[PDB]
Amino acid sequence: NRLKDQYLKEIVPALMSKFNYDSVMEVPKIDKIVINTGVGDATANAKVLDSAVEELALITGQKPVITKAKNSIAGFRLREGMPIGAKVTLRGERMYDFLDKLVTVSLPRVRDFRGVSKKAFDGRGNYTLGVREQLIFPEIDYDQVSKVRGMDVVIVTTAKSDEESHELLTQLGMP
Amino acid sequence: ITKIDKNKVRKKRHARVRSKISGTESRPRLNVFRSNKNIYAQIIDDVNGVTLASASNLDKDFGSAESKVDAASKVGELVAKRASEKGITSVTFDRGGYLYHGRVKALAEAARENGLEF
Amino acid sequence: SNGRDSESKRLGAKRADGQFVTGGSILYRQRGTKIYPGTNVGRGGDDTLFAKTDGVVRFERMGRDKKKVSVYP
Amino acid sequence: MKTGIHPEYRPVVFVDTSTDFKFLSGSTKSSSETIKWEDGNEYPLLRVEISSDSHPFYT
Amino acid sequence: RVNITLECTECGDRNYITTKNKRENPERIELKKYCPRLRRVTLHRET
Amino acid sequence: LVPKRVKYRREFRGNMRGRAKGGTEVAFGEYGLQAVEASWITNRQIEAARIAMTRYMKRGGKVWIKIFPHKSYTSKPIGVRMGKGKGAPEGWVSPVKRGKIMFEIAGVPEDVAREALRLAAHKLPVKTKIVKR
RNA sequence: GUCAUGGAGGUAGAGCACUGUUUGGACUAGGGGCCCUUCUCGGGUUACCGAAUUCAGAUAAACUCCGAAUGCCAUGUACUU
RNA sequence: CUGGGGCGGUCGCCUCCUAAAGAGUAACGGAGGCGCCCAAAGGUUCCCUCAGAAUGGAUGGAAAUCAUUCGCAGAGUGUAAAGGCACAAGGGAGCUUGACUGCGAGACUGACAAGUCGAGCAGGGACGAAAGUCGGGCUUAGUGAUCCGGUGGUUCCGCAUGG
RNA sequence: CUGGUAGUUAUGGCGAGAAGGUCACACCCGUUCCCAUACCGAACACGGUAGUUAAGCUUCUCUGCGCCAAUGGUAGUUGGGGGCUUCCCCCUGCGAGAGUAGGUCGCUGCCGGG
Ligand SMILES: [K+]
Ligand SMILES: [Mg+2]
Ligand SMILES: [Mg+2]
Ligand SMILES: [Mg+2]
Ligand SMILES: [Mg+2]
Ligand SMILES: [Mg+2]
Ligand SMILES: [Mg+2]
Ligand SMILES: [Mg+2]
Ligand SMILES: [Mg+2]
Ligand SMILES: [Mg+2]
Known part of the structure; x- marks a missing residue:
């Protein structure tokens, strides 16, 4: 709401002026942030997943959905079904809240950061923020929780080109 | 990312409904088209491909509603009436691909309350 | 190691286009829908097409690729 | 929901203790402390x- | 997997044979079936 | 020349009626050896014909084999009666229908091309015509 | 029996849209030869191999985007028998 | 049975090719399956779309789980193959037991014995707002007669009569 | 003119380009209520109309891909004949597939508003 306000106030005009869009409808907006855990160890011990769900619920403030495997793979020792990884899709005000916390509180708790990596865009307009550890997120309390697991954070933009998306993510605050 | 065309996927569902349901000169199809603003009804013959008694929200006759559901009940009331004037009773309800729930339900419930059998 | 085969199942058309059939007459024996149930025709459990009423059989083009059989009184 | x-x-x-800035953002784990x-x-x-x-990199 | 017979609780006769996997369904199966004697649906239970 | 694998190990002999449906006109070469009558060409015959072409050209110009031995053929040993199922795969043949260009050559002068192709023709069980594009 | 009309059916032929088999060229991700600090990770090298990609060209009882002649089923108020 | 017999192999059922564009069609001809399974993998209502590749991303590798794009089906369909199937017959979820009882015009197949399909009628139901669909499963294997025994039921008979 | 809903083997599809909008139709704004998500008001559902034609939709243009498609010839082939016969030839009737000239950016209803 703090960030979505800033977006509607003094990002849309500035960004529409920068690219010279015909209508305000063309202006890139953030549709959904999708966090993904990817607990492949769960195949052995299911209890490790229960924690990986609970820890993630606190980060998003929105219980995740336990993703089940697609095809059987002997290499990883995996078989059709069986719970592996947890998804959670953030939209609306509660999404901007997370994005704000991500750029304002979260990211500076990593040893360092280069910034908005040009390589880390899919070439369609969407960004994927590689998160090393779970202890970066202030709601987690790593002193209580066992394994670090990790995390995958996808920002799906309405942008057509990385250039447009890059400017949007930048002015929203992302390094 | 691409926005889903709500009417495209709606029309896809409508096909699934029309698979079972088709109008006859004896028992025509009461088809319902719903917009963001207003709602529209047509009692159709598929064998002839001709629209008998029809009614909409924007029609000059009955143009007073509080909610869209209430508006949609007035349409059911009027399309039922216009059907009875034409001399037809037994219809089959074509959801149009809409969930038989809010407005489209309130159209049927209304029409069914008047002289239309389904 | 070979030398096996199942009994032939006598599939195919059992009534001709333009032939008058009594209700219940089997029109086509088939695996799946080579030919679809038209008007006044039913599809049995094994995909057998039968006339639901008395009339004249008509094999018709459905749309481009598919095909149907109807019975018009 | x-x-x-x-x-x-x-x-x-x-x-933050050092900069002493304040902003609202919904989250879990309150702790119940006045503002x-x-x-x-x-x-x-x-x-x-x-x-x-x-943080120095950012500003 | 085995052949089963469902006995009518009211009628007292078993005119329904079925099959089940007794490893997956070790309990006695209960189905609501039409009893021709009573001319109505009745709870039928495996013997 | 042998197929790396086959769907079926045993195959009907087939027939050789009509003019070849394809490969009647020379495509890649200057000069081609055209089958005048139908026959089976074995892989052993294709190799004998190939080596007798290439040697005379002395690793000069190119040689396209336009037929491939796709079809297996079986045989019963001597002292074996009829029946007891089809025999074991023995070899590989290409049914060459009349009008099919079997070999093409390019990158040598006419005189050398025409000589290399007659040398090859003498290793094949089929009447041949030398044809140029 | 013929004529006319309608129809089911995938053979001959053909074709390569699919599945197998397959030739040549171009392209190109790998791998392997050959030295280098090197963990041969990556270069500078390549017709020793090689999976895609495309251009051209073949091939099939158990391939088919196609598809006859005939034969088959039927209808007629048609002509003969 | 048998390109003499023996030895070996085979014997019933399903799918394909042989099979010559209806059906049928032989060989100790060419290939594979079956002697089950499923309480949902059945019924119905509602909703949905697959394989793979590219690109980006923690543990994470060629390949796990996210995200976007392209994708008529290159997937799937309990299981062989063929014919079907994307209004899905494929995939979810809710409620259920029609995997009903009496039947059945009329057809297919067929030496017989058997086998197959079936609208519709009655009884009483499931799902659905209704239309409607439902007498198992995308379809086609998964079976074995008679005689004799066993078990349950029964407004049948009961060797003078009641049993 | 536009919204709805049908028929018709894509000549109707795909792709590319352009224009249009309070009259619809859209996106769009919101989650109090009915009702929703195996998490998400994304969708579904409900209540709105500040903003916008950007997209869908509508109309127009094009033959790049697809689709449709003659005539002629050829393959094959019923019947009748011949040969030297792994097969081939002649007469009569039928006659592809490929390729090609060409065609196509649809056509035909019914209902509501304008
Ligand atoms: K010779
Ligand atoms: Mg047979
Ligand atoms: Mg069945
Ligand atoms: Mg052929
Ligand atoms: Mg063929
Ligand atoms: Mg002998
Ligand atoms: Mg013998
Ligand atoms: Mg046949
Ligand atoms: Mg006895
Ligand atoms: Mg007595």
Whole structure:
């Protein structure tokens, strides 16, 4: 709401002026942030997943959905079904809240950061923020929780080109 | 990312409904088209491909509603009436691909309350 | 190691286009829908097409690729 | 939004000790501590490690 | 997997044979079936 | 020349009626050896014909084999009666229908091309015509 | 029996849209030869191999985007028998 | 049975090719399956779309789980193959037991014995707002007669009569 | 003119380009209520109309891909004949597939508003 306000106030005009869009409808907006855990160890011990769900619920403030495997793979020792990884899709005000916390509180708790990596865009307009550890997120309390697991954070933009998306993510605050 | 065309996927569902349901000169199809603003009804013959008694929200006759559901009940009331004037009773309800729930339900419930059998 | 085969199942058309059939007459024996149930025709459990009423059989083009059989009184 | 499924979404203020900035953002783990900013609309408080304004790379 | 017979609780006769996997369904199966004697649906239970 | 694998190990002999449906005109070469009558060409015959072409050209110009031995053929040993199922795969043949260009050559002068192709023709069980594009 | 009309059916032929088999060229991700600090991770090298990609060209009882002649089923108020 | 017999192999059922564009069609001809399974993998209502590749991303590798794009089906369909199937016959979820009782015009197949399909009628139901669909499963294997025994039921008979 | 709903083997599809909008139709704004998500008001559902034609939709243009498609010839082939016969030839009737000239950016209803 703090960030979505800033977006509607003094990002849309500035960004529409920068690219010279015909209508305000063309202006890139953030549709959904999708966090993904990817607990492949769960195949052995299911209890490790229960924690990986609970820890993630606190980060998003929105219980995740336990993703089940697609095809059987002997290499990883995996078989059709069986719970592996947890998804959670953030939209609306509660999404901007997370994005704000991500750029304002979260990211500076990593040893360092280069910034908005040009390589880390899919070439369609969407960004994927590689998160090393779970202890970066202030709601987690790593002193209580066992394994670090990790995390995958996808920002799906309405942008057509990385250039447009890059400017949007930048002015929203992302390094 | 691409926005889903709500009417495209709606029309896809409508096909699934029309698979079972088709109008006859004896028992025509009461088809319902719903917009963001207003709602529209047509009692159709598929064998002839001709629209008998029809009614909409924007029609000059009955143009007073509080909610869209209430508006949609007035349409059911009027399309039922216009059907009875034409001399037809037994219809089959074509959801149009809409969930038989809010407005489209309130159209049927209304029409069914008047002289239309389904 | 070979030398096996199942009994032939006598599939195919059992009534001709333009032939008058009594209700219940089997029109086509088939695996799946080579030919679809038209008007006044039913599809049995094994995909057998039968006339639901008395009339004249008509094999018709459905749309481009598919095909149907109807019975018009 | 389903009820009795997710944890609380209740608002909370984040403040870094060094820079001493304040902003509202809904989150879990309140801790129940009063705030100075917008005391009328009272929310919990959370003490935080250096933010972007403080962190040298960012500013 | 085995052949089963469902006995009518009211009628007292078993005019329904079925099959089940007794490893997956070790309990006695209960189905609501039409009893021709009573001319109505009745709870039928495996013997 | 042998197929790396086959769907079926045993195959009907087939027939050789009509003019070849394809490969009647020379495509890649200057000069081609055209089958005048139908026959089976074995892989052993294709190799004998190939080596007798290439040697005379002395690793000069290119040689396209336009037929491939796709079809297996079986045989019963001596002292074996009829029946007891089809025999074991023995070899590989290409049914060459009349009008099919079997070999093409390019990158040598006419005189050398025409000589290399007659040398090859003498290793094949089929009447041949030398044809140029 | 013929004529006319309608129809089911995938053979001959053909074709390569699919599945197998397959030739040549171009392209190109790998791998392997050959030295280098090197963990041969990556270069500078390549017709020793090689999976895609495309251009051209073949091939099939158990391939088919196609598809006859005939034969088959039927209808007629048609002509003969 | 048998390109003499023996030895070996085979014997019933399903799918394909042989099979010559209806059906049928032989060989100790060419290939594979079956002697089950499923309480949902059945019924119905509602909703949905697959394989793979590219690109980006923690543990994470060629390949796990996210995200976007392209994708008529290159997937799937309990299981062989063929014919079907993307209004899905494929995939979810809710409620259920029609995997009903009496039947059945009329057809297919067929030496017989058997086998197959079936609208519709009655009884009483499941799902659905209704239309409607439902007498198992995308379809086609998964079976074995008679005689004799066993078990349950029964407004049948009961060797003078009641049993 | 536009919204709805049908028929018709894509000549109707795909792709590319352009224009249009309070009259619809859209996106769009919101989640109090009915009702929703195996998490998400994304969708579904409900209540709105500040903003916008950007997209869908509508109309127009094009033959790049697809689709449709003659005539002629050829393959094959019923019947009748011949040969030297792994097969081939002649007469009569039928006659592809490929390729090609060409065609196509649809056509035909019914209902509501304008
Ligand atoms: K010779
Ligand atoms: Mg047979
Ligand atoms: Mg069945
Ligand atoms: Mg052929
Ligand atoms: Mg063929
Ligand atoms: Mg002998
Ligand atoms: Mg013998
Ligand atoms: Mg046949
Ligand atoms: Mg006895
Ligand atoms: Mg007595």
